[PDB]
């Protein structure tokens, strides 16, 4: 038989994350925009949640960038806004969702460019 | 373009129906890839029953367990997708039975059905965190003795959170939070243009 | 809601298991400090056990608790059946790492991102 | 009690705020004319009941809730603030 | 190399060296990129 | 010093690295070595610099030497050609 | 009604009559490979790379230019429509110079990918290629035009989005080169967009010539702070220094475009930048010292000085979070002399109702306007992506633009009513001609620039405009949600400052000189040390050492909008969040914390210790700050007028003139801009 | 990646022509040593049913007499066009399996010979610039080839979304990759089935009531390479 729990699945205790990176890390759920350089829209389809950016100090010996934040390069991809919000809640990371913004329909017709008076 | 024989996509397809009919209480979906591979999908409760039927049925003997793995689709409510690939040396065919398990909803263990799984199930617990009831001895296999966190989860940082160095003061190896001298350069590679309808 | 029970039907039954594990660790701390020749005090170690057992005191859900002891039991096994040598155990004490202050002024004075 | 600022965080199109907004429409101008230096801030919250925040001297802020209050009660509460 | 000599290209070395690692001729790695964030130097003239 | 004017400041400590060691640099600098090669006076508006050696060179590109004032320079070799 | 049903591969999508074949595929979700078709640019049909095959039709049709018709099935992936792409891509590539490892639009090429996805694997062009002489079109765009696929999107943008009408096609045949016939530089704001809009890497950015390659660039989405339109932008950072800022689309604010200033002044962000906290030494020079010492220099003076002896002149690019941390601090020592450098008239209701100081007809409401009364501002150089708005709505719709300012280049046909603030009274009386024009307008909008307000009779100019808006509203009988009066700003931290109750103008500090002054990012000359009291103890809080630094007893370096999760708000009050693209440099710290820390070293210690808390703080003082991307609908214009009627002021005959008369005026304004080597190169090119 | 050098085949012949004697020698030293047999014979016997059950899948199965060579049962590449004999074993034990491994060394020389005798003239990589990188002469003279070279090296194949488990007969046993793949150029999962994770597990059920030296012999008869097991 099933048991009842109203407790938001929080599994922060099982994930195995250091305390500092669960209480000081804000992740943003956003649908990636399109670099204006290209006109393809296949990278503006799935929602992604990305952890907040952290220190990137220069390395003294070779000048390479060096980072102390483990969750930096991690960007998880989630198909829908609801599912991504769920991941933040059970993992205990703070979230600030940004609504998808899709190009509004625009009316175009080759005839217009040859308008008597535009 | 690879050569494809539809003899198999028909044979395997039929078998799929046969399995489904025989085990309708658990089989949810049964598909054959365009690569001629069958992939019965079963409710997690059907782990024991569906495997056993395949290990011990005259018309479908699937004696050895090729592999037990768990893809992790973070989006999917049931995060893990335990996949069991089996081989039938009698009928020279392989099938894959895949179930879904969430982080804290354990799956049954099949060590009974195939003892090959004794190790792979420990491997799935160590890397992904799925738990297997009735397992003889579930304990980390691949990770370090004191490792905290399940590594192959998509939500675990590659570099991880701890690294080891020898400290003279304490004359013993000592973890420290990871500090990397050239972070993994995360090249974005997806192109903004699709390839086909698929 | 409507969850399936892992091993403990309710926080009550689950807590029973935690009690057992605590006892286990409590009885074990002394042995480890001797079989590993660790340079720690049994009392000190036993407090650490308490620390950990409470670090996760907030969990209210029965399923999460049950896994926590499964995992906890596994750790004990690695320390009583000794597969975890000192380096592994002492790591719990975070002996070498320099503690970080949590005072705002302290962080301001040191790190760009607190 | 030195009064420096009064903030009326009304919430537009909210049932309770009706009184607050009515006050703004009918008496705001008057209050300002009377106190022509004091900064009375009309701001628009959301999904929050109105609040007449008041900042007294030396960085002390005080709160008077205006939820579901009539136009003159809002007027009376505002008048009580700048004593 | 005597029979068919190699192509000379007016940059190639004439004295090739062995491992210089223990000797002070050894490569010591260094970043070759110039400074990136130039800073506002204070004004030296007292205001 | 180096190709890019990489010279540790008089106070930088990476200079300790060079203490008792040679800071590796190359006398042969490209910015200068290309200059020596003379402008090729081709007699066709557009010529191609395959890079010298065909497959053993650089991707083939055609240069427009039409501008009378300036000379075409292969984005690859740096070789210059004028009509 | 008005819903034809067309099938895209039998999906029965339904589209308004007028939708093109390419558009029909988009709603199903398919994407026609396209070049020369941009959503906000006219359809041209030049490339013919979009040929698709409507079912039962002899020839394939041009997607981007074919009005869809009832019943048609698009057959986008039909064997035919693939030969129609496998054979076009053959041609574009045939005359193309293969210098893809030179073309810095390497991974940002809509022609390799559309070739790797929709084209063939080889080539059959055994013949020779062509080469086109390059052009020095400007100091920002590098036109290696041998790359050009003659797609004419530049010639469109340069005519349709921006009104330059300079770039054009020259010649016919395979030596049609799309470059200026005579070598005249393409000098205009909105110029850099050509880079982003040319899918080929023919003309690309000259500063970001070869510093990077796109796969490496980590892309953080943030907000434009150089101008008050608050254009959305993406800061591309590699290994921790910003490499490029390119636009990201916001339908309402910047729809895929950004100004020349806010994409080439990322270089200015990297020099003359403050990093360590220097203090004035006995000798009289600023000496770098640790925070602890620099902060207590300031804290000790703060404890000694009482209210109205401590003042703050903030201004420029400071975020809302610092602005509330500076007010909460100076009130905890009871001075409410917090002020901003840009003077907004505050004798009637100012700062109190939130419509006296906002462009409340939305940036997207310029599209549905009828007559715009530009009064005393050059939008072209004060809000370039709002000038574009009136550009599009004068072209695609029919806005009648009228300017009461200097006759100035506006990229559109305006009516120059005159250069006199009093003729505003002329229209209010109904005496001037355009009085009827407005009478004829069902949806009119006045726009009073902040720079007109910055003159001495600015209070009178606002009052005079409010009177005219009042009877314009009465005569037109315009509906209430249509809002005629709006005023646009040119300083990013002005709407936020006025929102938090900061009182505009340094007029209050002028009348009583503070013993102490916190210049929170102020590089303006609003008060000078000669003007200050003898002590002249002022501490600069900012990022670049420009005017406030050398006259500063303490330097507390801060960050810039590329380096903090602060909030800003543009002119119609849409609050927006900058995200940290790069960690702040040196010992430099986030602006809000420096002030929280100074407070803890002083004993009045601001209650907020984590950003999320500083924000919760913003919520108590103001609503917009916490709700992002959300314009505030209602406003109270009627009571604003009543107080305007009480105010009596004289509009002096001096003509109202925008400070940015021509584009050299525009390139260098704020601190980051001034510190730009690219902006400096642009300035000398004009001069 | 690149065609064989001009001359390799001839040398892979000289060697093959002789290697046999080398295997023969080892034999005269170990196959019948009065002592090799003892330490190996009847050590780690694994039943046929148990070998399939614990997923042994390798010589370990073949040594117990189960006939399964994925190379004959499920041919991959052109291992179908060659002719070889699987070396099945009886009385499976360390000695028998050994004999099997010496016999596949022998059978592989039979397969190598053929491959040298019948290798066709042709290209060594698919002609789809989409999947295989363009030849360097082509990428340096043809635009479509540079674009295909640039995209392939910088971004990738862009495999169509799907998942497959493909197993070959690696020398140790069945080596399989379960490669789940989204449409992206980088994989999503790639569980490597290691013939060896299963074999080690069997160490327990093989070395029972055995001496310390027996354990050493059994780790050898499983060809455990910790790279595949640990992955
Ligand atoms: C010296 C070596 C140090 C090693 C210490 C030790 O091995 C590590 C370890 O504690 S292993 C993890 C223990 N963690 C649990 O066993 C879960 C506890 N579960 C709860 O705490 C619940 O929240 C509960 C409702 C029971 C609160 O109730 P209560 O506060 O315990 O009474
Ligand atoms: S544009 Fe630049 S990148 Fe795109 S193909 Fe032509 S050269 Fe290669
Ligand atoms: S320049 Fe860029 S945009 Fe203008 S035509 Fe050539 S390619 Fe099309
Ligand atoms: S997009 Fe169809 S014509 Fe260029
Ligand atoms: Zn060259």
**Six-digit token string for D40:** 């009375």
Q: Label the pairing between strands B27-29 and B41-42.
A: antiparallel
Domain residue extents for chain H: 1-231
Q: Which residue has the tokens 């993406």?
A: G234
Give the pairing of strands G400-404 and G414-418: parallel
The beta strand positions in H153-214, using DSSP E, are: 165-169, 174-180, 189-193
Q: Residue G2 corresponds to which tokens in the numbers above? A: 């008005």
Q: CB neighbours of G222 closer than 8 A, spacing ≥ 6?
A: G233, G234, G235, G561, G562, G577, G578, G579, G581
Are G678 and G202 contacting, i.e. CB atoms less than 8 angstroms apart? Answer: no
Concatenated DSSP letters of H109-167: HHHHHHHHHT--SS-SS-S-TTTSPPPHHHHTT-HHHHHHHHHHHHT---PPSB--EEE
Q: Which residues in chain G touch residue E31, judged by CB atoms under 8 angstroms apart?
A: none
Rg (CA), chain F: 19
Whose alpha carbon is nearest atom 7 of ligand 2? G100
Which DSSP state fits A117?
Answer: -
Q: Name the experiment that determined this structure.
A: cryo-EM
3-state secondary structure of D71: helix
Is residue A63 less than 8 Å (CB to CB) from chain F?
A: no
Tell me if G468 sits within 8 A of G460, measured CB to CB: no
Return the number of other C-beta atoms located less than 10 Å from residue B117's C-beta.
26
Single out the residue of G263, G112, G107 nearest to residue G193, CA to CA.
Answer: G263
Lookup result for tokens 């499920």: H74
Q: How many helices (H) and strands (E) does chain F have?
A: 2, 5
Concatenate the DSSP letters of all residues of E1-47 into one string. Answer: --SS-PPP-SSS-SS-----SSSTT-------S--SS-B----SS--
What is the 3-state composition of chain B as percent helix, strand, coil, each rounded to the nearest 5?
A: 20, 25, 55
Q: Which two tokens stand for residue A111?
A: 């005839």
User: Are the C-beta atoms of residues B132 and B106 closer than 8 Å to each other?
Assistant: yes
Gap between the Cα atoms of B52 and G679, Å rounded: 74
Question: How many Cα atoms sit within 13 Å of G494 on the Cβ side?
Answer: 31
Identify which of G181, G325, H91 has the alpha carbon closest to the alpha carbon of residue D59: G325
- In angstroms, the CA D4 to CA G72 distance is 69
The DSSP code sequence of G203-241 is EEESTTSSS--TTT-EEEEEE--SSTT--EEEEEEETTE
Nearest to G550 among E36, E37, E47 (CB): E47
CB atoms within 10 A of CB B9: 17
User: In Å, how far from its chain's centre is CA D19?
Assistant: 11
Judge residue G39's burial from the number of C-beta atoms within 10 Å of its C-beta, 0-12 exposed, 13-18 middle, 19 or more buried.
middle
Kindly give the pairing relationship between strand G537-540 and strand G516-519: parallel
Known binding-site residues of H for [4Fe-4S] cluster equal: 94, 100, 115
Block residue for tokens 């590539």 = G93
Pairing of strands G310-314, G338-340: parallel
The rounded Å distance from CA G154 to ligand 3 centre is 5
Question: In angstroms, rounded to a whole number, what is the distance separating the alpha carbons of residues B155 and B172?
Answer: 31
CB contact G352 to D (< 8 Å): yes
Answer whether B171's CB lies under 8 Å from G8's CB: no
Q: H70: closest CA among H205, H218, H195?
A: H195
CB contact set of G289 (below 8 Å; sequence gap of 6+): G276, G277, G278, G279
| Burial class of residue H65 (count of CB atoms within 10 Å of its CB; 0-12, 13-18, 19+) | middle
Cβ atoms of residues G193 and G153 within 8 Å = no
| Residues of the binding site of H | 94, 100, 115
Find residue G569's DSSP bridge partners: G575
How is residue B40 written in tokens? 């019965």
Q: How far apart are CA G544 and CA G269, in angstroms?
A: 8
Of H139, H206, H168, H218, the closest CA to residue H58 belongs to: H168
Residue F69 distance to chain E (closest CA, Å): 31
The rounded distance, in Å, linking the Cα atoms of H39 and H217 is 8
Query: Which CA distances in Å does G392 have to E6, G18, G346, G370, G399?
Result: 67, 20, 34, 13, 9
- Which residues on chain A are in Cβ contact (under 8 Å) with G628? 98
Tokens of H102: 């010496």
Contact residues, chain C, for B167 at CB < 8 Å: 96
Instruction: Round to whole Å and give the CA distance between G467 and G154.
Output: 44
Phi, psi of A84 (to 5 degrees): -65, -40
How many CB atoms within 10 Å of residue G63? Answer: 29
Query: What HEC string does G628-647 produce?
Result: CCCCCCCCCHHHHHHHHHHC
Q: Could you tell me if G463 and G646 are in contact, meaning their C-beta atoms sit under 8 angstroms apart?
A: no
Q: Is the distance from the beta carbon of residue G149 to the nearest atom of ligand 3 less than 6 Å?
A: yes
The CA distance from E11 to the nearest CA of chain F, in Å, is 7
What is the C-alpha end-to-end distance of chain A, expressed in Å? 73
Number of domains in chain D: 1
For residue G222, the cross-strand partners are G233
Cα dihedral across residues A44, A48, A54, A58: positive or negative: negative
Q: 3-state SS of chain G: helix, strand, coil percent to 5?
A: 30, 15, 55
Nearest CA to G647 out of B125, A30, H225, D29 is that of D29
Taking the C-alpha atoms of residue A91 and residue A21, their distance in angstroms, rounded to an integer, is 11
Please name which of G506, G624, G562, G460 lies closest in space to residue G245, comparing C-alpha atoms.
G562
Indicate the DSSP class of residue D3: E
Structure tokens, F43: 């007699």
Among F45, F46, F75, the residue with its CB nearest the CB of G99 is F75
Q: Are D20 and D8 in contact (CB under 8 A)?
A: yes
Domain coordinates of chain C in residue numbers? 1-114
- Cα separation, H1 vs H98, whole angstroms: 34
d(CA G590, CA D17): 37
Whats the size of chain D, residue-wise?
A: 83
The number of the ligand 1 atom at minimal distance from the alpha carbon of C56 is 21
| Tokens 């200050």 found at | G532
Instruction: Compute the distance between CA of residue G467 and CA of residue G484 in angstroms, rounded to an integer.
Output: 12
Structure tokens that stand for G653 in this block:
């005959």
Q: Which of G539, G288, G285, G554 lies closest to E45 in space, CA to CA?
A: G285
Structural resolution in Å? 3.1
User: In the block, which residue shows the tokens 């809640």?
Assistant: A89
Quote the distance between the C-alpha of residue C5 and its chain's center.
Answer: 23
Strands (E), chain B: 27-29, 41-42, 64-72, 80-88, 93-98, 107-108, 132-133, 162-167, 172-177
Does H197 contact B119 at a Cβ distance shorter than 8 Å? Answer: yes
**For residue C79, which phi and psi values (nearest 5 degrees)?**
-105, -20
How far, in Å, are B139, H42, H207 from residue H38 at the CA level? 37, 8, 16
Between helix G591-600 and helix G611-621 the angle, nearest 10°, is 90
Q: What is the DSSP letter of D46?
A: S
Tell me the sheet residues that pair with G101: none
* Cα H201 from Cα H211, distance rounded (Å): 18
Q: In which element (H, E) is residue G575 found? A: strand G575-577
- Distance CA(H102)–CA(H24), nearest Å, equals 9
Tokens at residue H87, please? Answer: 């070396």
* CA-wise closest residue to D41 among G595, G333, G327, G457: G327
Residues 6+ apart with CB under 8 A from C39: none
E strand or H helix at G665: helix G663-667
Coil, strand or helix at G304: helix
| DSSP-based three-state secondary structure for B64 | strand
Does B186 contact A at CB distance below 8 Å? yes
Distance G490 CA to ligand 4 centre (A): 39
Q: Cβ(C33) to ligand 1 under 6 A?
A: no
Distance CA C2, CA G605 (A): 47
| Contact (Cβ atoms closer than 8 angstroms) between residue D34 and residue D17 | no
Alpha-carbon dihedral sign for residues G601, G604, G607, G608: negative
Give the strand order in the sheet containing F80-82.
F40-41, F80-82, F72-73
* Closest C-alpha to G43, from A110, H63, B161, H28: A110
| Exposure of G503 in the CB half-sphere (CA atoms within 13 A) | 19
Q: From C57, C64, C94, C95, give the residue whose CB has the most ligand 1 atoms within 8 Å, as the site to mutate.
A: C57
Let me know if H170 is exposed, middle or buried by CB neighbors in 10 A (0-12, 13-18, 19+): middle
Identify the CA nearest to G243 among candidates D36, B116, E36, H189. E36
Closest-CA residue to G480 (of G637, G331, G297): G637
Note whether G365 and G445 are within 8 A (CB): yes
DSSP 3-state of D56: strand
Task: Find residue B107's DSSP bridge partners.
Answer: B132
CA dist G134 and G366 (Å) reads 39
Contact G385, G259 (CB under 8 A): yes
Cα G369 to Cα G486: distance, rounded to the nearest angstrom? 13
User: Rg of chain G's alpha carbons, rounded to an integer?
Assistant: 28
Q: Tally the residues of chain B.
A: 198
What span, in angstroms and rounded, lies between the C-alpha atoms of A67 and A57? 7
* Strand residue runs (E) in B101-161: 107-108, 132-133
Closest by Cα among G269, G270, G332 to G306: G332
Residue B113, token pair as written in the block: 């059905």
- The beta strand positions in chain F, using DSSP E, are 40-41, 46-49, 61-64, 72-73, 80-82
Q: Which residues does chain D have within 8 Å of residue G357's beta carbon, measured at their own beta carbons?
A: none
Q: Which CATH architecture has domain H1-231?
A: Orthogonal Bundle (1.10)
What's the CA gap between C11 and G145, in Å, rounded?
72
Range of the domain at D46: 1-83
Q: Is G435 annotated as a binding residue?
A: no
Position in ligand 3 atom list of the atom nearest CA G152: 5
Structure tokens at G289: 């010292």
Q: Name residues whose C-beta falls within 8 Å of residue H184's C-beta, 6 or more positions apart in sequence.
A: B189, B190, H158, H159
Other Cβ atoms closer than 10 A to A95? 16
Chain A nearest-CA distance from E19, in A, is 22
Pairing of strands A47-51, A26-30: antiparallel
B132 bridge partner residues = B107
* Owner of token pair 């209701």: G349
What's the distance, Cα to Cα, between the start and end of chain D in Å? 8
DSSP string covering B86-105: EEETTTTEEEEEE--B-TTS
Q: How close, in Å, is residue G121 to chain H by CA atoms?
A: 5
A18: which 2 tokens? 């250091």
Tally of CB atoms within 10 A around G359? 28
Cβ contact (<8 Å) for G596 and C113? Answer: no
Domain layout of chain G by residue ranges: 1-212, 213-270+667-687, 271-342+491-632, 343-490+633-666
Terminal Cα distance for chain H, rounded = 25
Query: What residue has token string 């093959």?
Result: H16
- Do the strands G218-223 and G278-280 form a parallel or antiparallel pair, or are they unpaired? unpaired
Instruction: Report CA-CA distances (Å) from G306 to D56, G309, G337, G591.
Output: 16, 6, 12, 23
Q: Dihedral, CA atoms, G499, G501, G504, G509, nearest 10 degrees?
A: -150
**Rounded CA gap, C4 and G494, in Å?**
56
The SS3 assignment for B82 reads strand
- What's CA G311's distance to the chain center, in Å? 30
Instruction: Identify the three-state secondary structure at position G619.
Output: helix
Up-side HSE of residue H114: CA atoms within 13 Å toward CB?
Answer: 11
Nearest by CB to residue B172, choosing from C83, C87, C97, is C87
Residue G86 sits at φ, ψ, to 5 deg, of -60, -20
Q: Are strands G4-6 and G13-15 parallel, antiparallel or unpaired?
A: antiparallel
Helix C42-55 vs helix C11-35: crossing angle, to nearest 10: 150
Query: Looking at ligand 1, which residue's alpha carbon is closest to its atom 32?
Result: C57
**Which among C79, C57, C78, C77 is positioned nearest to C68, based on CA atoms?**
C57
Binding site membership of G35 for ligand 4 (Cβ less than 6 Å):
yes
């Amino acid at each position: 038989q099933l048991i009842t729990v109203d407790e938001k699945l929080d599994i922060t205790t099982l994930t195995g994350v250091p305390e500092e990176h669960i209480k000081t890390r804000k992740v943003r759920i956003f649908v990636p925009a399109r670099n204006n350089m290209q006109s393809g829209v296949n990278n503006t389809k799935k929602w992604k949640m990305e952890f907040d950016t952290r220190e990137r100090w220069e390395n003294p010996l070779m000048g390479w960038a060096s980072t102390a934040d483990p969750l930096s390069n991690m960007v998880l991809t989630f198909s829908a806004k609801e599912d991504a919000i769920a991941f933040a809640e059970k993992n205990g990371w703070s979230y600030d969702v940004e609504e998808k913004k899709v190009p509004k329909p625009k009316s175009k017709s080759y005839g217009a460019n040859f308008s008597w008076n535009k | 373009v690879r050569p494809r024989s539809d003899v198999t996509h028909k044979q395997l397809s039929a078998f799929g129906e046969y399995v489904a009919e025989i085990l309708p209480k658990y089989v949810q979906q049964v598909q054959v890839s365009c690569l001629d591979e069958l992939e019965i999908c079963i409710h997690p409760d059907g782990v024991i029953p569906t495997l056993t039927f395949l290990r011990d049925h005259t018309n479908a003997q699937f004696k050895s367990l090729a592999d037990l793995t768990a893809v992790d689709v973070p989006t999917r409510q049931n995060r893990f997708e335990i996949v069991y690939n089996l081989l039938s040396l009698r009928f020279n065919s392989r099938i894959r039975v895949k179930t879904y398990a969430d982080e804290l909803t354990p799956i049954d263990s099949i060590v009974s059905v195939h003892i090959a799984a004794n190790w792979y199930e420990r491997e799935v617990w160590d890397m992904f965190g799925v738990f297997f009831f009735n397992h003889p001895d579930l304990r980390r296999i691949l990770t370090d003795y004191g490792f905290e966190g399940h590594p192959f989860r998509k939500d675990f940082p590659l570099t991880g959170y701890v690294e080891l160095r020898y400290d003279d003061e304490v004359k013993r190896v000592v973890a420290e939070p990871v500090e990397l001298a050239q972070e993994f350069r995360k090249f974005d590679l997806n192109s903004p243009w699709e390839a086909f309808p698929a | 809601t409507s969850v399936k029970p892992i091993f403990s039907r309710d926080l009550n039954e689950a807590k029973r298991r935690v009690r057992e594990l605590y006892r286990a660790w409590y009885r074990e701390v002394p042995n480890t400090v001797h079989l590993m020749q660790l340079d720690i005090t049994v009392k000190q170690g036993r407090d650490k056990v308490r620390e950990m057992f409470m670090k996760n005191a907030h969990v209210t859900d029965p399923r999460v608790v049950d896994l926590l002891v499964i995992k906890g039991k596994m750790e004990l096994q690695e320390t009583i059946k000794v597969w975890k040598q000192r380096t592994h155990v002492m790591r719990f004490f975070h002996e070498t790492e320099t503690p970080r202050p949590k005072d705002f002024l302290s962080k301001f004075y040191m790190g760009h991102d607190p | 009690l030195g009064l420096r600022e009064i903030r009326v965080h009304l919430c537009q199109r909210s049932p309770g705020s009706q009184g607050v907004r009515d006050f703004i429409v009918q008496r705001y101008v008057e209050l300002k004319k009377a106190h022509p230096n004091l900064p009375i801030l009309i701001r628009e919250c959301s999904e929050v009941q109105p609040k007449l925040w008041a900042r007294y001297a030396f960085g002390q802020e005080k709160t008077v809730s205006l939820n579901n209050l009539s136009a003159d009660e809002v007027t009376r509460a505002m008048q009580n603030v700048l004593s | 190399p005597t029979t068919n000599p190699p192509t000379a290209r007016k940059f190639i070395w004439t004295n090739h060296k062995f491992n210089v690692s223990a000797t002070p001729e050894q490569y010591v790695p260094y970043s070759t990129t110039r400074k990136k964030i130039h800073e506002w130097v204070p004004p030296s003239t007292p205001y | 010093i180096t190709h890019t004017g990489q010279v540790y400041d008089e106070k930088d400590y990476r200079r300790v690295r060079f203490v008792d060691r040679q800071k590796e640099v190359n006398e042969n600098f490209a910015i200068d070595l290309i200059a020596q090669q003379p402008v090729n006076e081709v007699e066709h508006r557009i010529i191609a610099c395959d890079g010298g050696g065909g497959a053993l060179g650089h991707p083939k590109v055609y240069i427009n030497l039409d501008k009378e004032t300036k000379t075409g320079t292969c984005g690859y070799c740096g070789l210059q050609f004028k009509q | 009604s008005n819903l034809i049903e067309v099938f895209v591969d039998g999906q029965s999508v339904m589209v308004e009559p007028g939708t093109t074949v390419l558009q029909a595929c988009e709603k199903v979700g398919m994407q026609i490979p396209r070049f020369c078709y941009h959503e906000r640019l006219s359809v041209a049909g030049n490339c013919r790379m979009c040929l698709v095959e409507i079912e039962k039709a002899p020839k394939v049709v041009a997607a981007c230019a074919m009005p869809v018709m009832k019943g048609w099935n698009i057959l986008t992936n039909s064997e035919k429509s693939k030969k129609a792409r496998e054979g076009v891509m053959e041609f574009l590539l045939a005359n193309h110079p293969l210098d893809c490892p030179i073309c810095d639009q390497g991974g940002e090429c809509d022609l390799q990918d559309q070739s790797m996805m929709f084209g063939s694997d080889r080539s059959r062009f055994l013949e020779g290629k062509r080469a086109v002489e390059d052009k020095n079109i400007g100091p920002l765009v590098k036109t290696i035009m041998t790359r050009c696929i003659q797609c004419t999107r530049c010639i469109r943008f340069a005519s349709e989005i921006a009104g330059v009408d300079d770039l054009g096609t020259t010649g016919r045949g395979n030596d049609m080169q799309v470059g200026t016939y005579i070598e005249k530089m393409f000098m205009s704001e909105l110029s850099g967009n050509v880079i982003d809009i040319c899918p080929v890497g023919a003309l690309t950015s000259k500063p970001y010539a070869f510093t990077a390659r796109p796969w490496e660039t980590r892309k953080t989405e943030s907000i434009d702070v150089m101008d008050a339109v608050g254009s959305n932008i993406v800061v591309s950072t590699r290994t921790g220094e910003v490499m490029r800022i390119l636009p990201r689309m916001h339908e309402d604010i910047n729809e895929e475009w950004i100004s020349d200033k806010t994409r080439f002044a990322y270089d200015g962000l990297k020099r003359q930048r403050l990093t360590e906290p220097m203090v004035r030494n006995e000798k009289g020079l600023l000496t770098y010292t640790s925070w602890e010492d620099a902060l207590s220099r300031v804290a000790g003076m703060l404890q000694n000085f009482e209210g109205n002896a401590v003042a703050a002149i903030a201004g420029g690019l400071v975020d809302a979070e610092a602005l509330v941390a500076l007010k909460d601090l100076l009130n905890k020592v009871d001075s409410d002399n917090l002020c901003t450098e840009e003077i907004f008239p505050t004798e009637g209701a100012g700062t109190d109702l939130r419509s006296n100081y906002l462009l409340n007809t939305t940036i997207a409401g310029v599209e549905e306007a009828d007559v715009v009364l530009l009064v005393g501002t050059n939008p072209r150089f004060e809000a370039p992506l709002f000038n574009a708005r009136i550009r599009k709505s004068w072209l695609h719709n029919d806005l009648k633009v009228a300017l009461i300012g200097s006759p100035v280049d506006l990229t559109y046909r305006y009516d120059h009513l005159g250069d006199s603030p009093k003729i505003l009274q002329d229209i209010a009386s109904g005496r001037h001609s355009f009085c009827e024009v407005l009478k004829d307008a069902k949806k009119p909008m006045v726009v009073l620039g902040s720079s007109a307000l910055q003159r001495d009779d600015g209070a009178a100019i606002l009052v005079a405009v409010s009177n005219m808006v009042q009877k314009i509203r009465v005569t037109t009988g315009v509906a209430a949600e249509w809002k005629v009066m709006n005023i646009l700003h040119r300083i990013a931290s002005q709407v936020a400052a006025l929102d938090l109750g900061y009182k505009p103008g340094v007029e209050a500090i002028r009348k009583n000189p503070p013993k102490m002054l916190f210049l929170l990012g102020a590089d303006g000359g609003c008060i000078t040390r000669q003007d200050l009291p003898k002590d002249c103890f002022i501490v600069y809080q900012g990022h670049h050492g420009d005017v406030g630094a050398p006259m500063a007893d303490v330097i507390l370096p801060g960050a810039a909008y590329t380096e903090k999760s602060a909030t800003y708000v543009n002119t119609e009050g849409r609050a927006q969040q900058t995200k940290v693209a790069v960690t702040p440099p040196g010992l430099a710290r986030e602006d809000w914390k420096i002030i929280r820390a100074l407070s803890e070293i002083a004993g009045i210690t601001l209650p907020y210790d984590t950003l999320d808390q500083v924000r919760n703080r913003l919520e108590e003082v103001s609503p917009n700050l916490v709700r992002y991307d959300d314009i505030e609908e209602t406003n109270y214009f009627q009571q604003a007028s009543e107080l305007a009627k009480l105010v009596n002021q004289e509009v002096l005959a001096d003509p109202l003139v925008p400070p940015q008369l021509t584009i050299k005026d525009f390139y260098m304004t704020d601190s980051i801009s001034r510190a730009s080597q690219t902006m400096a190169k642009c300035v000398k090119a004009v001069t | 990646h690149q065609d064989l050098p001009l001359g390799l085949l001839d040398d892979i012949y000289e060697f093959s022509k002789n290697f046999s004697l080398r295997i023969d020698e080892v034999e005269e030293m170990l196959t019948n040593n009065r002592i090799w047999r003892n330490r190996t014979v009847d050590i780690g016997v694994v039943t046929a049913e148990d070998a399939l059950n614990y997923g042994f899948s390798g010589v370990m199965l073949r040594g117990s007499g189960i006939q399964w060579d994925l190379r004959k049962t499920q041919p991959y590449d052109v291992y179908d066009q060659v002719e070889f004999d699987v070396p099945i074993g009886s009385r499976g034990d360390c000695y028998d399996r050994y004999l099997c491994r010496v016999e596949e060394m022998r059978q592989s020389l039979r397969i190598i010979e053929q491959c040298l005798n019948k290798m066709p003239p042709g290209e060594i990589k698919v002609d789809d610039a989409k999947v295989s990188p363009p030849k360097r002469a082509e990428m340096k003279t043809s635009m479509e080839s540079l674009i295909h070279h640039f995209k392939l090296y910088t971004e990738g194949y862009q495999v169509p979304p799907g998942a497959t488990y493909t197993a070959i007969e690696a020398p140790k046993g069945e080596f399989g990759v379960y490669l789940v793949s989204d449409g992206s150029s980088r994989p999503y999962r790639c569980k490597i089935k290691a013939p060896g994770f299963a074999h080690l597990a069997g160490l327990d059920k093989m070395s029972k009531g055995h001496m310390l030296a027996d354990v050493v012999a059994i780790i050898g008869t499983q060809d455990i390479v910790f790279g595949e097991i640990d992955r």
